[PDB]
UniProtKB/Swiss-Prot annotation:
It comes from the Bacteria. Keywords: Disulfide bond, Fimbrium, Lectin, Signal, Virulence. This is F17f-G fimbrial adhesin. Belongs to the fimbrial protein family. Its main location: other. One of its GO terms (cellular component) is pilus. One of its GO terms (biological process) is adhesion of symbiont to host. The chain holds residues 23 to 197 of 343 of the full protein. A carbohydrate binds at A40, N41, D85, T86, S113, T114, Q115, G116.
């Protein structure tokens, strides 16, 4: 069986967070996973349910850096994005605007457990300005959906949750 136990709208990163550069364009801010969201318990699963995760970014793709997409927020600011299973360290680098397999999946046994997820992003400066500061308002990022497999089914259970980037300021 499966049921939804998480939240549908999720904020990524602390509200009105401020980040400073520590070091060429596009320039990527080394924010680790400070700008993220994670929840180990989004779906409750049991009885042999097999589930993985698909992730999708809705922001426009405005470039490619080191193998993954640069998603645009404004003409001067973009994002590198990772989506995946619960632990931030297992995030899958996102490219494109299609649903992508971000967690290969697992199968619970004949007991009850949960399926979680995580998302984190890193700011990218696409074009510099005279103020050496870049701010972005709250913006929808994309979604993550559970992907049942091996015959498992979502039935009438909610499959998708969404993510919105909390407003932030980048200081250089
Ligand atoms: C309470 C708990 O730990 N659930 C982790 C869950 O968050 C994760 O999505 C899944 C697959 O790695 O394995 C579960 O054991």
């Amino acid at each position: 069986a499966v049921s939804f136990i998480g939240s549908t709208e999720n904020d990524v990163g602390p509200s009105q967070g401020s980040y400073s550069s520590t070091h060429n364009l596009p320039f990527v801010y080394n924010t680790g996973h400070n700008i993220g969201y994670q929840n180990a318990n989004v779906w409750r699963i049991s009885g042999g349910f097999c589930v993985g995760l698909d992730g999708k970014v809705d922001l426009p793709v405005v470039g490619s850096l080191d193998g993954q997409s640069i998603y645009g927020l404004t003409e001067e600011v973009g994002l590198l994005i990772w989506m995946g299973d619960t632990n931030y360290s297992r995030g899958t680098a996102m490219s494109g605007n299609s649903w992508e397999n971000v967690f290969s999946g697992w199968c619970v046994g004949n007991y009850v457990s949960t399926q979680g997820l995580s998302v984190h992003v890193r700011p990218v400066i696409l074009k510099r300005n005279s103020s050496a500061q870049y701010s972005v308002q709250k913006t929808s990022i994309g979604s993550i959906r559970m992907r049942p497999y091996n015959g498992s089914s979502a039935g009438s259970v909610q499959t998708t949750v969404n993510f919105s980037l909390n407003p932030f300021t980048l200081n250089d």
